[PDB]
Symmetry: D3
Subunit: 232 residues, 6 copies
């Protein structure tokens, strides 16, 4: 035999993690140990191997800078240290025993350890272009891939307006609060993962590019932008 | 408040640059400072932030190896050091003040600093294939994405011919000069960004792949090649 | 002249290699030397240059971390050290003499040195999905991009079956040998680069994803998988 | 020539700096430029050089990872970028013009640019060993290489006691304030760079190693320690 | 409160370790957490700190490449990852809670976590010089800092002789076994950490430098050497 | 068995080298191969080993970043690549065959390959302090560890004077030539590795620190300095 692996891991990009594989039912030092990777619905890959008796190793060139293999004879345990994790590293990792002789590569497998690296929040803004007539009403959409609610209860969703050649300016903060000096024609609403910015009556000074932003979970991200322009 | 940023930067790939953001109209140490990136017509990205009072920082994992944030209390100035610049780094960079409390992320913005990383010169060669009959005339085109004139007044545009299985051989240098031993059937012309190689009467020994080259601005680059082959 | 280059190189990913270019028929220290790269049917690229007299160098930013140029005056030889080789590095490399003055960049070329970095073995498995009726016969294909025969004479081609939510289990090893406990309804055959797994009569417990694997040449690789599922 | 260098730089460890050297009185591109280092009363070292005409460079192997040389032709200015500065980098840096024919090395010198990397604060604690009789009064000294006063007005000088087999525990904070539980027999005094801890009547529980600590300027540092033991 | 740290770690050079610090008795997110290092009888050093609420961090420049700080809000636990450990990393590591208003630095301390990086085995060989008369008996000592016994039961202690101008050659293996060709005049004895080599009757061919060697625990090491020369 | 190693290597700092070890008299793949280092009169160190059959390797942690081991089965040759060489890398490197059953370590040795990394030139300047009376004659010595003669025939030995509060200024170039403005009272002489600077009649303006410098072999270096002061 049996190969027992450590529990599930949940980490953020850049983190490191050390997985273990304990062996029983045979002489640990008499068989080699391999490690295999399996991405969500993508396929299997060979990482490398170690001989527990002498400590010699051999790696897949692709994973040489990402993984390090070791063993602890007294406890009959094999380890794999992973560093600088990225989204491409989310997978189920297995340890497998190599035969006593040299024919079969993986005769006994551990149950596997799932390692999930968190995904950045994506903000989808629609539409990309919004032609309007002065005096008309307008509405812009901003939806997130995950909840924007912070553990402290606040939802840090904001809206900015960038005029041609200038830097962005704050309009709305915390979903529905207007910044000091912003006209009441602007209003924000929504919650969780769906938000909306509305303009009751469009003025000439309102034309430009609008952006939504979330400051609830790192890394903080911005929407793609919506260009409000004169209809013609 | 007011945030005044440093002037425009023009650099080549691999260079480093340090941007500054001076604050006035408030107590510098009482508010946090963030830095934002905006690529030409692509969108906004959050880089990271620093607390001027204690010096603590938090970065977007994506930019951790590219940027370093610091401050100088006496002059109330914030700095961002960028290293190993590439074409993907050309953008307008902004500094923005974080509220006294914690609601709004960017209530006051600097005017921004544009950082332009120079682009490599691309040589477009046409046609890719040119079938010809022995005895015929031939003409090949080579156009550059930027001027090939050097500050010293010379235009280092050259033409090479590579026969099957052999190394390239020089034909023309400095736009229109024939190398010692090259037949007068070969002539080159052009200037600035558009060049042409002509062959008055094609001989069997002329078949192979022709390449244009520019040695005026680093990195020196070659065109994609034109294969002159027997018509059939 | 004459520029004589060193012989062909055959290496695996991650390796390093040092190429040489010996000059004769002129005063070595009186002309600069450049190095050029040419990938299989892709085009020419400028790497960098060195002045043999003073030792000064100038590099294409793209190759600065990959190559280092040096010279040995007594033997009139120029060298280029390449490190951390990858498949993108397989090419023919040339050394070329820069004029005495500054007009023509490459008036005399060496014959070139071909550097080939070995390619990983790819296992193509077909079909991706195989719907079947219980009791029917089934056949799965696995073909390799290169021979799976090891120098010692064995062919380490194996087959694995992964049931929903479980780890893979060994079925066949060394092309046609059944693992202890595997029913005789499973049989494997083939050699060289083409292999087949057959099931005489499909049972309910046989449904899942089948994978072929090769442990003959590093890095060891797996096929893409075939999902055997109930016909409906 | 005349060679005008940029002003003094006061930086903390880890920072980078970019120095300039403006040339006048001759044709900038016709002469090579060298850079030299001089540490406080220690001697001279050659860093490297650049040819402004072609852009080629040559470095002292020791400084290859630390310095990068570039030039700007239009403004007749040479630059030297230094990165990841440490205490061993504090020095006066000079630029110097090479002879036209390379007959001599440093014909004309700039006035120099002083770069100072800040030194960490060192707390000298006296005495290392302090044997006392039960009931006696004890006195410990802590003197610093730099003022412990912070720009906000406070002086973060503290005193800790580590009893045998235990972790340290706080005794005095902000020079003279007692933490919770601390006996009135302990008192602290001092200002700027000189401080003292006094124990009015030594008891068995007072025995161990005392440490002074400063939390005013990064990196925060501790004194060497004082072992209080009895003259049994 | 209470700050509970993880158990002792015994690691070899090159490994990484992740330490935890569980907090109870107060609101985890309301106070900053610091980390401190204490080498065996050497003093205290400040590593860095993290604000559990916002996630900002500040490091001692010296430890920036060695340590990474993170927190897990739900479980009220702080973490410190140490990488590429060396002998200078062996120490007791502590976590400590900052004052609510930052008036003092380390108000409450964890019990500490001991991290021991294994030391290489040192073979002390005596004497450095050994003048003898032809025909005399010679004796050489080799004592180790750790037992040369391997878990498999064997003791890989060997003796080598390097004759002037030649490469070393094996004399004795597994403490007392003679290699091929070795004269019966050479004999080895000893066990555990103390060994001896004896030469019954010194001959001219015996002159040179003798070395003891241990191949039981990585890295394998040699003794300093003993030069056998005649008292002419 | 016989183990034939490649010839001597003379390299400059920063270079890389690849050593070979050809085996004969036994089946190459049936025995492990070890590599050992021996610095000039300093002792022996174990680098690492490789199993030619499976390709597994084990390194001494100290040399992991410096050495890489590989084998070529067809030619029965083992290789060791060393990179980024420094002065501490100069030594004789050996390959040695392991026992068939691992009973002993280095059973058969190659003849060794000497690798010499060139040392920088050291200029010893005497005396460090030189008190003189106004009007007296002064003499300064500068002797080198290697010849200052360049392959082109010239000897780039120079003398500089740094007046209090000023930058250095050139006095003598090419051993005995006076720079512009330099008084006739200054004269230089010498050749090869021994040089002298003489001042016929010391004046107040002559006071300061004198430095000899060599610009013949990289890295260019300065002498320690001589402070000329008056015996007031």
């Amino acid at each position: 035999v049996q190969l027992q692996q450590s529990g599930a891991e949940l980490v953020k990009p850049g983190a490191s993690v050390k997985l273990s594989c304990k062996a029983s039912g045979y002489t640990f030092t008499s068989y080699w140990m391999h490690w295999v990777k399996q991405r969500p619905g993508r396929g299997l890959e060979w990482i490398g191997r170690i001989d527990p008796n002498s400590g010699g190793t051999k790696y897949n060139e692709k994973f040489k800078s990402k993984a390090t293999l070791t063993v602890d004879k007294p406890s009959s345990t094999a380890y794999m240290q992973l560093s600088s994790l990225t989204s491409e590293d989310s997978a189920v990792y297995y340890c497998a025993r190599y035969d006593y002789y040299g024919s079969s590569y993986f005769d006994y497998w551990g149950q596997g350890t799932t390692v999930t690296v968190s995904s950045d929040i994506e903000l989808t803004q629609t539409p990309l272009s919004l032609p309007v007539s002065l005096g008309d009403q307008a509405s812009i959409s901003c939806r997130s891939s995950q909840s924007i609610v912070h553990s402290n209860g606040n939802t840090y969703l904001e809206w900015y307006l960038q005029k041609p050649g200038q830097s962005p300016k704050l309009l709305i903060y915390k979903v529905s609060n207007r910044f000091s000096g912003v006209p009441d024609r602007f209003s924000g609403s929504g919650s969780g993962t769906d938000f909306t910015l509305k303009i009751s009556r469009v003025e000439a000074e309102d034309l430009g590019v609008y952006y939504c932003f979330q400051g609830s979970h790192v890394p903080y991200t911005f929407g793609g932008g919506t260009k409000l322009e004169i209809k013609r």
